[PDB]
Design an enzyme around this catalytic site. Structure first.
Site, PDB file in Angstrom:
ATOM      1  N   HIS B  43      -8.152   6.987   4.134  1.00  0.00           N
ATOM      2  CA  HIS B  43      -6.507   7.097   4.085  1.00  0.00           C
ATOM      3  C   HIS B  43      -6.286   6.314   2.639  1.00  0.00           C
ATOM      4  O   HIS B  43      -5.145   6.444   2.273  1.00  0.00           O
ATOM      5  CB  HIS B  43      -6.252   5.967   5.280  1.00  0.00           C
ATOM      6  N   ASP B  99     -12.143   7.559   9.634  1.00  0.00           N
ATOM      7  CA  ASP B  99     -11.522   7.094   8.403  1.00  0.00           C
ATOM      8  C   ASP B  99     -12.671   6.921   7.287  1.00  0.00           C
ATOM      9  O   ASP B  99     -13.002   5.784   7.159  1.00  0.00           O
ATOM     10  CB  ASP B  99     -10.609   5.611   8.384  1.00  0.00           C
ATOM     11  N   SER B 198      -8.736  -2.166   1.763  1.00  0.00           N
ATOM     12  CA  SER B 198      -9.341  -0.964   2.627  1.00  0.00           C
ATOM     13  C   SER B 198     -10.090  -0.168   1.874  1.00  0.00           C
ATOM     14  O   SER B 198     -10.141  -0.172   0.311  1.00  0.00           O
ATOM     15  CB  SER B 198      -7.893   0.060   2.849  1.00  0.00           C
TER      16      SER B 198
HETATM   17  C1  LIG Z   1      -2.169   4.190   3.859  1.00  0.00           C
HETATM   18  C2  LIG Z   1      -2.624   4.079   5.405  1.00  0.00           C
HETATM   19  C3  LIG Z   1      -2.633   2.810   6.173  1.00  0.00           C
HETATM   20  C4  LIG Z   1      -2.687   3.103   7.481  1.00  0.00           C
HETATM   21  C5  LIG Z   1      -2.871   2.082   8.307  1.00  0.00           C
HETATM   22  O1  LIG Z   1      -2.724   2.128   9.766  1.00  0.00           O
HETATM   23  C6  LIG Z   1      -2.177   2.963  10.339  1.00  0.00           C
HETATM   24  C7  LIG Z   1      -2.129   2.820  11.917  1.00  0.00           C
HETATM   25  C8  LIG Z   1      -1.542   4.015  12.449  1.00  0.00           C
HETATM   26  C9  LIG Z   1      -3.683   2.698  12.326  1.00  0.00           C
HETATM   27  C10 LIG Z   1      -1.444   1.502  12.088  1.00  0.00           C
HETATM   28  N1  LIG Z   1      -0.434   0.970  11.449  1.00  0.00           N
HETATM   29  C11 LIG Z   1       0.704   0.698  12.262  1.00  0.00           C
HETATM   30  C12 LIG Z   1      -0.771   0.084  10.641  1.00  0.00           C
HETATM   31  C13 LIG Z   1      -3.153   0.755   7.861  1.00  0.00           C
HETATM   32  F1  LIG Z   1      -3.347  -0.418   8.487  1.00  0.00           F
HETATM   33  C14 LIG Z   1      -3.182   0.527   6.121  1.00  0.00           C
HETATM   34  C15 LIG Z   1      -3.627  -0.951   5.626  1.00  0.00           C
HETATM   35  N2  LIG Z   1      -4.814  -0.936   5.762  1.00  0.00           N
HETATM   36  C16 LIG Z   1      -5.207  -2.325   6.121  1.00  0.00           C
HETATM   37  C17 LIG Z   1      -6.478  -2.453   6.399  1.00  0.00           C
HETATM   38  C18 LIG Z   1      -6.950  -3.459   7.077  1.00  0.00           C
HETATM   39  C19 LIG Z   1      -6.239  -4.804   7.416  1.00  0.00           C
HETATM   40  C20 LIG Z   1      -6.459  -5.915   7.821  1.00  0.00           C
HETATM   41  N3  LIG Z   1      -7.942  -6.191   8.360  1.00  0.00           N
HETATM   42  N4  LIG Z   1      -6.003  -6.919   8.252  1.00  0.00           N
HETATM   43  C21 LIG Z   1      -4.744  -4.806   7.204  1.00  0.00           C
HETATM   44  C22 LIG Z   1      -4.210  -3.367   6.490  1.00  0.00           C
HETATM   45  C23 LIG Z   1      -2.713  -0.912   4.286  1.00  0.00           C
HETATM   46  O2  LIG Z   1      -3.227  -1.151   3.307  1.00  0.00           O
HETATM   47  O3  LIG Z   1      -1.453  -0.794   4.363  1.00  0.00           O
HETATM   48  C24 LIG Z   1      -2.905   1.490   5.585  1.00  0.00           C
END
Ligand SMILES: CCc1cc(OCC(C)(C)CN(C)C)c(F)c([C@@H](Nc2ccc(C(=N)N)cc2)C(=O)O)c1
Ligand SMILES: [Ca+2]
Ligand code: NA
Lengths: 28, 250, 5
Positions: B43, B99, B198
């Site tokens: 992603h 992912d 991420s």
């Molecule tokens: C650019 C694509 C993306 C997608 C993400 O999730 C998509 C989905 C459909 C699983 C849920 N969405 C509603 C957050 C997502 F979390 C991110 C998000 N990644 C993320 C990873 C870990 C944490 C944590 N451990 N608290 C928080 C955020 C981000 O960086 O925006 C980025």
């Protein structure tokens, strides 16, 4: 062959400040 | 990383920064798995809902870093990308299932005190360590809070959570290619990955052979460090056959 | 970010 052995830690037998927390959690 | 601490020098020598060329910015974390291959979250490279589609020429990989923003002269190495390989069944439509992506470097990177590859688990490692309560370690240069940015690489140790608890925490469909980690409200302690983290590694130190293994890739979450929420991670071992197939072919 | 060479 040398994967996951850190030059500044495992390779010189030094421990980082919190790796023991991980070990203490590996109970089974 | 929320509620973590500054890394020690050379604490995570497999840590890789995914760096966008223009504008110059942190895209994600990643990890070094050999002199030529870097592991990250799909992603980070491909997310159509938000018009994210990075090509090889859009980014650089920065290896051996500690400081977030500094050019770490004589220490970090900057590498260009030869080719990106995203899992063919990566699910960006729904829940980020599978992912995971690989990146081949244009040239091999020299190992040093600050640059060294992590191990990938085999079946036995994964079976032994991927257990509720067992702690791993997450690192990155991402946000310090859900709602700022660190001077240096951050580190937090977090316990793996029981699959039903992970499931019950969210409306998102959870697959076998995911696991979750973090403290429960009743546990008092805090910590989580956040925006900018991420693609970075969730690692464990085997008590059997004293080697670090990458069990997860920071994948997704709802906010950061919220009570009753958990970070979700790509299950590296479950996708290792794909990893091996790609490296063996290319 | 500091400029890269
Ligand atoms: C650019 C694509 C993306 C997608 C993400 O999730 C998509 C989905 C459909 C699983 C849920 N969405 C509603 C957050 C997502 F979390 C991110 C998000 N990644 C993320 C990873 C870990 C944490 C944590 N451990 N608290 C928080 C955020 C981000 O960086 O925006 C980025
Ligand atoms: Ca649910
Ligand atoms: Na939480």
């Amino acid at each position: 062959a040398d994967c996951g052995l850190r030059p500044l830690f495992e390779k010189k037998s030094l421990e980082d400040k919190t790796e023991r927390e991980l070990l203490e959690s590996y109970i089974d | 990383i929320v509620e973590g601490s500054d890394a020690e020098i050379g604490m995570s020598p497999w840590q890789v920064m995914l760096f966008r060329k223009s504008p110059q910015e942190l895209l994600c974390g990643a990890s070094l798995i050999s002199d030529r291959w870097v592991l990250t979250a799909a992603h980070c490279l491909l997310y159509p809902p938000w018009d994210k589609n990075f090509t090889e020429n859009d980014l650089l990989v920065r290896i051996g870093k500690h400081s977030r923003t500094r050019y770490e002269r004589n220490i970090e190495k900057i590498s260009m990308l030869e080719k990106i390989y995203i899992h063919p069944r990566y699910n960006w439509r729904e829940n980020l299932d599978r992912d995971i992506a690989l990146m081949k470097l244009k040239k091999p990177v020299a190992f040093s005190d600050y640059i060294h590859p992590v191990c990938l688990p085999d079946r036995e490692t994964a079976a032994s360590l991927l257990q509720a309560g067992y702690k791993g370690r997450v690192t990155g240069w991402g946000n310090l809070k859900e709602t700022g940015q660190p001077s240096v690489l951050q580190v937090v140790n977090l316990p793996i959570v029981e699959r039903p608890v992970c499931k019950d925490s969210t409306r998102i469909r959870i697959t076998d290619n995911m696991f979750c980690a973090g403290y429960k409200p009743d546990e008092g302690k805090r910590g989580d990955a956040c925006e900018g983290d991420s693609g970075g590694p969730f690692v464990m130190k085997s008590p059997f052979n004293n080697r670090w293994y990458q069990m997860g890739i920071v994948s997704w979450g709802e906010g950061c460090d919220r009570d009753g929420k958990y970070g979700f991670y790509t299950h590296v071992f479950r996708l290792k056959k794909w990893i091996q197939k790609v490296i063996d072919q290319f | 970010f500091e400029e890269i060479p």
